């Protein structure tokens, strides 16, 4: 159930396992736990050592170079909550340089309330990618898990699937398991943070992590808000006071803690706002008999004496030592060598201070985007200045954009000069505004505020260029902006045009194809766009190119990013035209839409034409041998320096000349396709070739504006009995026993018939064949037999067309006279 036994305040264990045996009788650690620096240790020194009683840790857990430890599943088999009240360099779980460690094994870790997890330099640690930290820690983007065995090698991670839950991480579902035999317990979304039981039932509203029986505060394992009498409560009822943000205590316990410090060497506890806090905040003073903080009859701030008069803020834990401070009796150095935005936890610890007796220095703060976390910073006395007599030292801040919101924020620097160098995203406008507000305008000397490094990567030209004449064509865009001239019009070396296609409106500022535009002659400067793609929206804005000025402000002018879309036109040719004739009169034609729509495609045009049969087939003798009828580079850097130098040299010569000279004396079938890519075609002749003309056309009513077609050919299937001969077989016998055979031709064949074959066989004799071609059939009106032996024959006739061979006609019997 809840926490039994002792409380074992924060402890550190080193150099052996001898002193760790004092964690046996306590379940919750009221502080931080550190197991580190164990070299004379062996893997057999941890099997018999286990701490099932430990449940929750308040500050953090640190593990640094403990040899022989392979898994935490035995040391802490029931650790479930790390509150993270006090972090170790903005981290709540640090595992650093754990040699011989192979798996985490913290299979009960459910919630990490505050902080992050860092795992680094563990050459044998695996089962790291199989942990869903999003279910454990809220802000998972701040975790730093690098240089392990999960990426250096390919160590296997076997989560039993025949039960470990699978959750999506990036784009795939993977099973979650701490070890080879323990699955990461995942609760349903109905149990937000209170946890679930074995059967998946939500615990009490005041619960956290795990519980024995659902919907019962007294059967939980880790309290979400506070602990009291084995029960989790939202707030401490009277006469109990909050203590360490995790449990409720009476006045006697806090008094004993206070007296144990007063009568000894410390955190002399007091009472304020129904809490037993270490030090009373600003504006209150502890009394003699009672410990409750009465408000003072005077504005007494909380001074925080910084040792050595210089404090470096580099993490959440360093800033937290200034929590509740109002006046700082020292100097602050803000250096977050990071990559994750800590302003959320920085404004909670800082931002309550008003005065700084020394200097404020912000150096190499990569992650900071603004100094707005100083909510109440008003006075910088500068009684102790940075070397070189500086009271505000900003340097090498790669993402600093805003110093303060000067509309409502007041600032007053008493002494010391300013310094701003290598702030690529902090512009001179903010610096000068802060100079005016602070009152140190006439205090800085040259090169204290840099010019080629402050804001060199930020667009703050603070002057608007207005486009004056824009119109678009097929593949060109015409641009015209109002002319711009600095006071020295020769300083304008020309304009620079940035363009980029954008499907949607909101586009970033500052790809980005560049073209250099000369200044006009003193006619708007303008420029003509070329090499565009039709029906595409582009982002356009112009940024001036002025010569640098070391003395005064350099200069600035730029235009808002306008969006222009070029017009539509005829699309491309439809792709992949394929035609298939599944039936004797039906053809299915399939195609792909053109790759260049150049607008919205509205309709398609398909044309057909029956191909006339080749003339030579009607005038070829195919009974002869040989009768095989077919069965149908950015501008390099030194270069631009050359134009810069030449343009400056021309002005230098002009100025020298002017100074010297002047002395101041004293029809075919078709159809319309609607949003379809195929068609079934009716009314087609059987076994005939067709020519298809296919177009994709995006405009019908206001005249068609569309391109050339795609051509393809297809042949329909033939009929069954098209080639078969119909009609009775008619024969004539002359005086000289000449047999003249006649038969009705197949009026409607599959295209055309090339030849006929007649098979006459006298009874008992062998079959005789004779080919009759088109010309023979026309000349003889069928067949003519000369010189035949007496007897009775059997005559069968077949017709051969383009489709193939037709069926033979019924046998016919004729008898020639014997004489």
């Amino acid at each position: 159930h809840l926490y039994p036994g002792e409380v074992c305040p924060g402890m550190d264990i080193r150099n052996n396992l001898t002193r760790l045996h004092e964690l046996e009788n306590c379940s919750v650690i009221e502080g931080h736990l550190q197991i580190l620096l164990m070299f004379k240790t062996r893997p057999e020194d941890f099997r018999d050592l286990s701490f099932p009683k430990l449940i929750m840790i308040t500050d953090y857990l640190l593990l640094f170079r403990v040899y022989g430890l392979e898994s935490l599943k035995d040391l802490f088999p029931n650790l479930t909550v790390i509150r993270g009240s006090r972090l170790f360099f903005n981290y709540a779980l640090v595992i650093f340089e754990m040699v011989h460690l192979k798996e985490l094994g913290l299979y009960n870790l459910m919630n990490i309330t505050r902080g992050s997890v860092r795992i680094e330099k563990n050459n044998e640690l695996c089962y790291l990618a199989t942990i869903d930290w999003s279910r454990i820690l809220d802000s998972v983007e701040d975790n730093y898990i690098v240089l392990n065995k999960d990426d250096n090698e390919e160590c296997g991670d076997v989560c039993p699937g025949t039960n470990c839950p699978a959750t999506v991480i990036n784009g795939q579902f993977v099973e979650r398991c701490w070890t080879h035999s323990h699955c990461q317990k995942v609760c349903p979304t109905i149990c937000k943070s209170h946890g679930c039981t074995a059967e998946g039932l939500c615990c009490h509203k005041e619960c956290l992590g795990n519980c024995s029986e659902p919907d019962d505060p007294t059967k939980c394992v880790a309290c979400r808000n506070f602990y009291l009498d084995g029960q989790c409560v939202e707030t401490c009822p009277p006469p109990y006071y909050h203590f360490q943000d995790w449990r409720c205590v009476n006045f006697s316990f806090c008094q004993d803690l206070h007296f144990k410090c007063r009568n000894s060497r410390c955190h002399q506890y007091v009472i304020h706002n129904n809490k037993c806090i270490p030090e009373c905040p600003s504006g209150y003073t502890m009394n003699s008999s009672n410990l409750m903080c009465t408000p003072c009859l005077g504005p007494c701030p909380k001074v925080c004496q910084i040792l050595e008069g210089e404090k470096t803020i580099d993490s959440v834990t360093s800033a937290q030592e200034l929590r509740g401070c109002t006046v700082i009796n020292g100097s602050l150095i803000i250096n977050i060598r990071g990559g994750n935005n800590l302003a959320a936890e920085l404004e909670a610890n800082l931002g309550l201070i008003e005065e700084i007796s020394g200097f404020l220095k912000i150096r190499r703060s990569y992650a900071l985007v603004s100094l707005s976390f100083f909510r109440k910073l008003h006075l910088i006395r500068g009684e102790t200045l940075e070397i070189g007599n500086y009271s505000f030292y900003a340097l090498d801040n790669q993402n600093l954009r805003q110093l303060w919101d000067w509309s409502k924020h007041n600032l007053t620097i008493t002494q010391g000069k300013l310094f701003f160098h290598y702030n690529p995203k902090l512009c001179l406008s903010e610096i000068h505004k802060m100079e005016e507000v602070s009152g140190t305008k006439g205090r800085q000397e040259r090169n204290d505020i840099a010019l080629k490094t402050n804001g060199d990567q930020a667009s703050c030209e603070n002057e608007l260029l207005k486009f004056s004449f824009i119109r678009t064509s097929f593949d060109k865009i015409l641009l015209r902006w109002e002319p711009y001239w600095p006071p020295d019009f020769r300083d304008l070396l020309g304009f620079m045009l940035f363009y980029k296609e954008a499907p949607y409106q909101n586009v970033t500022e500052f790809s980005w194809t560049v073209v250099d535009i000369d200044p006009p002659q003193r006619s708007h400067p303008g420029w003509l766009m070329r090499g565009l793609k039709p029906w595409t929206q582009y982002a356009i804005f112009v940024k001036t190119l002025v010569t640098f000025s070391d003395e005064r402000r350099t200069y600035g002018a730029k235009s808002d990013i306008i969006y222009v879309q070029t017009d539509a036109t005829n699309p491309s040719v439809p792709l992949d035209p394929i035609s298939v004739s599944n039936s004797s009169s039906q053809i299915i034609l399939k195609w792909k839409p053109p790759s260049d729509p150049n607008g919205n495609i509205t309709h398609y045009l398909v044309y057909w034409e029956r191909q006339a049969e080749d003339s030579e087939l009607f005038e070829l003798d195919y009974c002869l041998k040989g009768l095989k009828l077919p069965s149908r580079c950015p501008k390099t850097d030194s270069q631009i320096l050359k134009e810069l130098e030449e343009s400056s040299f021309r002005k230098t010569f002009e100025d020298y000349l002017h100074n010297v000279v002047f002395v101041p004396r004293p029809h075919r079938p078709f159809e319309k396709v609607v949003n379809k890519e195929s068609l079934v075609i009716s009314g087609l002749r059987h076994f005939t070739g067709y020519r298809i003309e296919l177009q994709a056309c995006n405009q019908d009513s206001p005249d068609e504006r569309c391109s050339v077609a795609a051509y393809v050919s297809a042949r329909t299937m033939p009929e069954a009995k098209a080639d078969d001969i119909v009609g009775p077989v008619t024969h004539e016998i002359f005086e000289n026993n000449v047999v003249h055979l006649m038969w009705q031709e197949p009026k409607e064949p599959n295209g055309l018939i090339v030849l006929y074959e007649v098979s006459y066989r006298r009874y008992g004799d062998e079959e005789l064949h004779l080919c009759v071609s088109r010309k023979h059939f026309a000349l003889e009106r069928g067949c003519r037999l000369r010189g035949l032996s007496p007897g009775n024959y059997s005559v069968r006739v077949r017709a051969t067309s383009l489709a193939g061979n037709g069926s033979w006609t019924e046998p016919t019997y004729f008898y020639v006279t014997d004489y």
Partner: peptide, 21 residues
């Protein structure tokens, strides 16, 4: 001669209004 000036080279806007009324 517009051809000789920007069919082998690149002509900007400024030297294009000179061919206008």
């Amino acid at each position: 001669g517009i051809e000789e000036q920007c069919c082998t080279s690149i002509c900007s806007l400024y030297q294009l209004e000179n061919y206008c009324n």
